[PDB]
Ligand binder design. Structure first.
Ligand SMILES: C[C@@H](O)[C@@H](C=O)[C@@H]1NC(C(=O)O)=C(S[C@@H]2CN[C@H](C(=O)N(C)C)C2)[C@@H]1C
Length: 270
């Protein structure tokens, strides 16, 4: 009862032509295992979207280190990265590992990301190692939170593919790589994300539940979102939407991400 894949491709190609850039998508119906991709194996910059996987890496570490989420981290006199809305307010108090993970995912706090990378996960190399450990052989993180957003065409640093992002989200949300407590916590963090209102969330009816993480590099019209979507009385759908434009000076488009998401989700004829 689903739409022919070529219909969906044809719609995405027209949207690409309107956008003036590249759109890559992959979606997984976790109940039927039906999938759909377009440019699904092309690399796109992750931008800040890696932070959802960073939070997962922290939870995986906590599953083996009792009490890790409650550990308090202080960062007096640290120079805080731009776009650190939570960490810049908690210097006097410090923040727990859980609070840092929630902030990095839900507010895209760069300071929280670099604090977790430095102090728990082992830098970009350790982030990449975590993804390898769940069978993602595509993801790579090469640089720290600010520098990874250059989004230069042809530069494979700090990239993944829509398929790999969606497949890794599926593993983390519903597979065995995290325990029940950790899955539930990860999903609750994604559900509370605050930066995705104009992207995948804008593509679904208001009574569906979404958990997501966005990325906005700020150059090369490059922006993205990936999500778990719970339709009414239907198995969850995992979706990744990544975009870029050839011109350094172009702006990204939230609306194109929302429209691509709508096209892909409608193709499952839920
Ligand atoms: C490198 C980092 O600084 C960015 C990562 O990609 C941050 N993460 C994103 C994101 O999309 O998640 C924004 S965009 C910002 C978060 N939402 C705001 C927004 O959508 N507005 C103001 C409309 C703007 C950061 C720069």
């Amino acid at each position: 009862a689903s739409q022919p894949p070529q219909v969906t491709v044809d719609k995405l190609k027209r949207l690409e032509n309107d956008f003036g850039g590249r759109i890559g998508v992959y979606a997984i119906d976790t109940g039927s295992n039906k999938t759909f991709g377009y440019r699904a194996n092309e690399r796109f910059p992750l931008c800040s979207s890696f932070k959802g996987f960073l939070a997962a890496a922290v939870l995986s570490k906590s599953q083996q280190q009792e009490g890790l989420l409650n550990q308090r981290i202080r960062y007096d006199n640290r120079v805080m990265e731009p776009h650190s809305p939570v960490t810049e307010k908690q210097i006097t108090t410090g923040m727990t590992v859980a609070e840092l993970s929630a902030a990095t995912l839900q507010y895209s706090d760069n300071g929280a990301a670099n604090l977790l990378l430095e102090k728990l996960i082992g830098g970009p190399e350790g982030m990449t190692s975590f993804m390898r450990s769940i069978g993602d052989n595509v993801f790579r993180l090469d640089r720290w939170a600010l520098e990874l957003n250059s989004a230069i065409p042809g530069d494979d640093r700090d990239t993944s593919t829509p398929k790999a992002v969606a497949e890794s989200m599926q593993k983390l949300a519903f597979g065995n790589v995290l325990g029940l407590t950790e899955r539930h916590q990860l999903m609750d963090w994604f559900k509370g994300n605050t930066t995705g209102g104009a992207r995948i969330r804008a593509s679904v009816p208001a009574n569906w539940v979404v958990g997501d993480k966005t990325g906005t590099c700020g150059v090369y019209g490059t922006a993205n979102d990936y999500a778990v979507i719970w339709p009414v009385a239907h198995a969850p759908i995992v979706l990744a939407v990544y975009t870029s434009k050839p011109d350094r000076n172009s702006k990204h488009s939230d609306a194109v991400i929302a429209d691509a998401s709508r096209i892909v989700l409608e193709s499952f004829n839920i």
